[PDB]
Amino acid sequence: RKPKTGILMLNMGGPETLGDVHDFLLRLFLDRDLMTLPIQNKLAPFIAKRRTPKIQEQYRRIGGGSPIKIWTSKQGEGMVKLLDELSPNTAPHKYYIGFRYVHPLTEEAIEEMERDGLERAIAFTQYPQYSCSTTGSSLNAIYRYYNQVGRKPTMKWSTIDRWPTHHLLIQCFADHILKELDHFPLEKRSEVVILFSAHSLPMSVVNRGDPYPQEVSATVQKVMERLEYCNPYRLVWQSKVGPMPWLGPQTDESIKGLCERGRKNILLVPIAFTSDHIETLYELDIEYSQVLAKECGVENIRRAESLNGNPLFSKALADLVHSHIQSNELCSKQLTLSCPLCVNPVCRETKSFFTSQQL
Amino acid sequence: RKPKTGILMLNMGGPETLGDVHDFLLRLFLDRDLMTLPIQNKLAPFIAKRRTPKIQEQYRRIGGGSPIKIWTSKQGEGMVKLLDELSPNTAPHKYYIGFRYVHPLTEEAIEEMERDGLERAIAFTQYPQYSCSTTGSSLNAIYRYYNQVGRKPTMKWSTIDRWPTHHLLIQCFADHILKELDHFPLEKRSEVVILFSAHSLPMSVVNRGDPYPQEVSATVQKVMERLEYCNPYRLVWQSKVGPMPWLGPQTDESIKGLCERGRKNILLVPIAFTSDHIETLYELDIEYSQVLAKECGVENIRRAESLNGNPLFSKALADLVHSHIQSNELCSKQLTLSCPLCVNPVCRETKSFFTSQQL
Ligand SMILES: C=CC1=C(C)c2cc3[nH]c(cc4nc(cc5[nH]c(cc1n2)c(C)c5C=C)C(C)=C4CCC(=O)O)c(CCC(=O)O)c3C
Ligand SMILES: C=CC1=C(C)c2cc3[nH]c(cc4nc(cc5[nH]c(cc1n2)c(C)c5C=C)C(C)=C4CCC(=O)O)c(CCC(=O)O)c3C
Ligand SMILES: C[C@H](CCC(=O)O)[C@H]1CC[C@H]2[C@@H]3[C@H](O)C[C@@H]4C[C@H](O)CC[C@]4(C)[C@H]3C[C@H](O)[C@]12C
Ligand SMILES: C[C@H](CCC(=O)O)[C@H]1CC[C@H]2[C@@H]3[C@H](O)C[C@@H]4C[C@H](O)CC[C@]4(C)[C@H]3C[C@H](O)[C@]12C
Ligand SMILES: C[C@H](CCC(=O)O)[C@H]1CC[C@H]2[C@@H]3[C@H](O)C[C@@H]4C[C@H](O)CC[C@]4(C)[C@H]3C[C@H](O)[C@]12C
Ligand SMILES: C[C@H](CCC(=O)O)[C@H]1CC[C@H]2[C@@H]3[C@H](O)C[C@@H]4C[C@H](O)CC[C@]4(C)[C@H]3C[C@H](O)[C@]12C
Ligand code: FES
Ligand code: FES
Ligand SMILES: [Pb+2]
16 A cells, blocks of 8 residues: 655765765765855865765775665665554555765655655654764754755654664664674683774864763663673774864774773774774774784774664664654654754754644 | 771762861862872962962852761761661671861771771772762772882772662652752743753863763763653753863853753753752852843753752662672772773772772
């Protein structure tokens, strides 16, 4: 039967092949919800083209691109499967991929959700932890869309804007951590340092009140609680781009910092992005790792597998949608509140949109 | 009879009267574990005098001094009583007050714990969330004491170095929040914004890897989980002293930021310090509260009361010591791991000291 309940899966998406890099960077640096530059429509095209080469190299270092589109579909298909059996009253359920910087674009998925004549549309963020630069932008995209077309929705919108401590998300992290630990020498297992690595945020964003850091910290605690604190752990922030100040200990300097101090068995954990992505300096660059071993004696730096296609993740997705439908909520209580120092007119307009939806 | 189990309650302490302010700051600015200044033994004395007036004024604004000594005693007495019934095998128990910058000083309490011939001494930090500047300093003080007195322990030490998510602690917070919410007009209650306010940390401390922020974040999530996200919330960092950069949104700015954005009913929650301390700029200064009420229409700003003398707190303190003894652990797994960017050699010595304790 015709599709009743649509499920828009929001994520920034990623460049499918090295060829898509430029179009990805382009839309990203044009995102006024992610950032703001002086002349914007002019230097954005440049900045993209400019550093497009080094980003292409980075993606080449991990397989030649991002597998998010494939992975997201598998999970989407696995989620829909369970939704039909979980909540028949809202079936048939259909998932749509709403990527922010690559096809299928958010706006592209919305237009199809419309054309398909759905009764209930659910903006389901794929970032467990809320940041105004990730979920906020994907959510502002939906808003901006209708404000553009000029027209109003033809279906009821609602949203699952965050889920940093969902019990199944936590069980997945716990499972994957235990799996890697077993890849460490039997007698080293106990002294392995778990470094939860999440993407950093510029301090100016943190200081305006972004909820992201506190949420990621929450996810980390649930995980360790579940693992019964079997090992020591630390939450560090990876990558970080630019000369300006970014949050907490950088993942790079924390790894080096840890080896110069006796901890040689490190287990990195991607706690804030569910799909494979660009790794850290000590994982990609060899000379820097060569020095780290000749000067600190680093013996093991492992990475827990991304939630990728774990069957228990789909179950996590389906459960969230199900509770959502049950609860009748339009959005979390946290979305009804903008950053204490929020300076984006759009933000408040997006709040209204979801809290003002029919039913 | 003779006291079998001793319990050292660690905390920075506070000047009981305006007269004690000077020696308080003195010992504080002299704490190399808290901060490092050039020719510190010559600067601390100066900074103390140069700041004492400002602080006396602040303590006056809240009653004339700090009530931590009395409150810690009441909780101490109430902790002991519950321990003699809970742990008959380690009873009788005796609590000792080890304040870092005021009498009874940490060293004074240690020196008395031995004289009483204790079989087991427990360093129990009163800060639920671990920071190297609070719990770390209190713990490095115990180690520094034996490295000074030359001799070694006559009792078997162990420590409860953190407890950010202890269910009873979380329950006390959830109870005090519900109670303040009931002071707001029945119809504005759902609009109240919960501002969890914790003492900020210098960004240089956050970046070296202090666990404090992540743990404080955990406390916050457990509390809102318990209250079922009844209201929207934010974790902001208060006080913040100096010119350099300190962490996340500042309490003063967020309050103003929140009012400038239509949020008039705010509820402040002291999530990282269990006793009364210096309030924020908008709770003290009259002119600032005036400027705010005019340009924002701030209806009500309330502060949840400190855990202070809640009996459910003593039940919390007691439950922890009991579990600690039953678990037969010497310290948390987190203590065995230093900051990835740590540069205080004492840290490592304090670690060894506790993990190397007999039994
Ligand atoms: C406002 C704050 C943020 C800014 C300005 C930001 C900027 C960027 N983020 C990028 C990529 C990326 N960022 C990413 C996840 C996040 N990024 C985040 C927050 C920000 N990310 C948060 C929060 C994330 C959550 C999970 C991912 C997954 C990529 C794609 C590349 C890679 O590093 O995996 C790129 C393009 C690649 C590069 O090396 O230039 C920029 C300019
Ligand atoms: C390394 C990081 C830290 C520095 C440099 C720091 C510095 C200070 N902290 C003070 C007082 C204080 N700090 C306090 C809780 C904390 N302080 C903390 C971390 C730090 N605190 C953390 C973490 C806390 C919470 C658990 C309290 C309760 C006081 C006493 C007065 C007040 O703000 O109530 C004073 C004395 C008042 C003044 O302005 O001279 C200084 C200089
Ligand atoms: C002046 C402005 C800062 C605005 C702000 O934060 O308030 C900054 C932000 C982005 C910067 C630009 C980007 O870093 C891209 C270029 C980097 C080159 O090294 C200099 C020119 C370059 C084109 C920069 C010019 C200038 O420093 C910019 C435009
Ligand atoms: C990542 C990119 C290039 C730096 C690099 O070569 O790694 C830099 C250049 C322009 C930078 C942005 C501009 O300086 C404008 C903003 C300044 C704010 O303090 C942080 C976010 C902010 C939106 C910056 C994010 C990031 O640092 C940018 C986008
Ligand atoms: C030079 C040194 C920085 C060393 C460091 O941490 O890297 C800084 C840190 C603390 C500073 C001092 C403190 O801020 C206290 C005083 C503040 C006064 O405004 C100037 C002198 C004053 C006595 C400062 C002198 C100098 O700027 C100090 C000593
Ligand atoms: C705020 C206070 C007094 C300065 C003043 O007289 O106005 C100053 C004196 C000593 C300073 C501290 C010391 O310089 C040691 C640290 C130096 C780091 O770069 C920042 C945090 C750091 C922990 C400083 C925080 C703050 O600037 C202090 C605590
Ligand atoms: S930037 Fe966070 S609500 Fe607007
Ligand atoms: S400063 Fe944190 S372990 Fe030394
Ligand atoms: Pb302080």
